[PDB]
Design an enzyme around this catalytic site. Structure first.
Site, PDB file in Angstrom:
ATOM      1  CG  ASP A 206      -1.948   0.957   1.238  1.00  0.00           C
ATOM      2  OD1 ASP A 206      -2.899   0.692   0.496  1.00  0.00           O
ATOM      3  OD2 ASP A 206      -1.747   2.032   1.904  1.00  0.00           O
ATOM      4  CD  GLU A 230      -3.029   2.347  -3.059  1.00  0.00           C
ATOM      5  OE1 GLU A 230      -2.415   2.536  -2.043  1.00  0.00           O
ATOM      6  OE2 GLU A 230      -4.234   2.589  -3.097  1.00  0.00           O
TER       7      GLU A 230
END
Ligand SMILES: [Ca+2]
Ligand SMILES: [Ca+2]
Length: 476
Positions: A206, A230
């Protein structure tokens, strides 16, 4: 574990909390507006493995596993796993270090890979960043491990985007200073042991754009398996370059034009043909990006349009484009939640029907993809190429000359007239027999090399040499 190996995979992304309960309920309430733990666990998952697997998936991506702040905050519970406090301990709501064990085990046993989502940018805390008690974090027990308190006010400013805190005055996310060899050190150490201990094959990372560029390489080398990150940016010029620091990134540059081409009968096919080429030429390895049209941070597809012809078209794009196909739990049941938290519906509430329309489409597109790669070692590295485009059509070609799949997608919708498309540029020989493997119909290549493709109901068409289907179960 390998980049080169993750190339032939297709992923089912699920929120642990919301996929499958241990009592296998299909009716337990789960109201999204409440934002509380609904009860999903890693045991529920092990129990519904046939459901994933029969869609043809080869791996699953599950949300973060670390021990979360315990409170119910003003914004709900940490049911999503993105507010950790203790990384050497597990979120007891999903199960046990054993459970997390069995799953990695049921997967591996069935030929599946296990991908785990991880955070490194920040911790979570119930309160104003100003009053944080750094003594709860384990092991980052001092504010000395953290950048000083500020919030990102301007995102066009990249140093403040990486050094200030995400979150707010209500739920604050203490931002680590990953610049210090200590932060780093511990983080590299952890990633590596975590992977070893539960046997996972890849990591989804993330908030990558929030950590300065230089931390990642060693992150990715320590982990020792494929890392897909991401980078929440639609400009290829901003995102692609991260490929220079970790194996892959999620295809956000493709996400925006893809959604826009199929969300309306008037979606632009040009923007997508054009973006497919840009990413092919400017990103390091388009074959290591993850394709997606839905995730838990954006409204679901069916929130924009209830048309199943359109839904069917975007699902087949994502499985057949370059990269790793990713489908978000609920997409296959046509869920229509809007922004967070409405897009985090429990999958169990649909009943898990294997006779759903998108279930069947997805299954028969994974089927062809899985087999082509059985027989064309060049498929995962052949670069998708748009060979044709019209105001309501795009068609692409991928696979070695001679074993190539030609996908024809359209945005005409569930009406959409019935007419014949004479597709040129497929590169099949004359008089050759092709199977449309979605609808299991056959068509014969022209004479001039043109393919009279039969179109109707705005349906996607996927062509492949009939001859090459053999000891094949695709259409019997
Ligand atoms: Ca940061
Ligand atoms: Ca995120």
């Amino acid at each position: 574990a390998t980049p080169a190996d993750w190339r032939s995979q297709s992923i089912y992304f699920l929120l642990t909390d919301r996929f499958a309960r241990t009592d296998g309920s299909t009716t337990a309430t789960c109201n999204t507006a409440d934002q509380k733990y609904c009860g999903g666990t890693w045991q529920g998952i092990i129990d519904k493995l046939d459901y994933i697997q029969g869609m043809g998936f080869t791996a699953i991506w599950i949300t973060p596993v670390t021990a979360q702040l315990p409170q119910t905050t003003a914004y709900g519970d940490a049911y999503h796993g993105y507010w950790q406090q203790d990384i050497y301990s597990l979120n007891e709501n999903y199960g046990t270090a054993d459970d997390l064990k069995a799953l990695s085990s049921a997967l591996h046993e069935r030929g599946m890979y296990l991908m785990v989502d991880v955070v490194a940018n920040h911790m979570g805390y119930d309160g104003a960043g100003s009053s944080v008690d750094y003594s709860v974090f384990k092991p980052f027990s001092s504010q000395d491990y953290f950048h000083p308190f500020c919030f990102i006010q301007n995102y066009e400013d990249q140093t403040q985007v990486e050094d200030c805190w995400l979150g707010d005055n209500t739920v604050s996310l203490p931002d680590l200073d990953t610049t210090k060899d200590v932060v780093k050190n511990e983080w590299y150490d952890w990633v590596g042991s975590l992977v070893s201990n539960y046997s996972i094959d890849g990591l989804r990372i993330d908030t990558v754009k929030h950590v300065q560029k230089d931390f990642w390489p060693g992150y990715n080398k320590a982990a020792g398996v494929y890392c897909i990150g991401e980078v929440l940016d639609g400009d290829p010029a901003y995102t692609c370059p991260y490929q220079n620091v970790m194996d892959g990134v999620l295809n956000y540059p493709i996400y925006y034009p893809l959604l826009n081409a199929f969300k309306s009968t008037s979606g632009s096919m040009d923007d997508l043909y054009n973006m497919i080429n840009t990413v092919k030429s400017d990103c390091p390895d388009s074959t290591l990006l993850g394709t997606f049209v839905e995730n838990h941070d954006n409204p679901r597809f069916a929130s924009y349009t209830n048309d199943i012809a359109l839904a069917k078209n975007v699902a087949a794009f994502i499985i057949l484009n370059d990269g790793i196909p990713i489908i978000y739990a609920g997409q296959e049941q046509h869920y229509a939640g809007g922004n967070d938290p409405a897009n985090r519906e429990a999958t169990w509430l649909s009943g898990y029907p294997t006779d759903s329309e998108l279930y069947k489409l997805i299954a028969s597109a994974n089927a062809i993809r899985n087999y082509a790669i059985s027989k064309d070692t060049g498929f995962v590295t052949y670069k998708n190429w748009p060979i044709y485009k019209d105001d309501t059509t795009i068609a692409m070609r991928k696979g070695t000359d001679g074993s190539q799949i030609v996908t024809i997608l359209s945005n005409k919708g569930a009406s959409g007239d019935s007419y014949t498309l004479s597709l040129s540029g497929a590169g099949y020989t004359a008089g050759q027999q092709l199977t449309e493997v979605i609808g299991c119909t056959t068509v014969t290549v022209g004479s001039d090399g043109n393919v009279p493709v039969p179109m109707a109901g705005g349906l996607p068409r996927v062509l492949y040499p009939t001859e090459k289907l053999a000891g094949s179960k695709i259409c019997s």
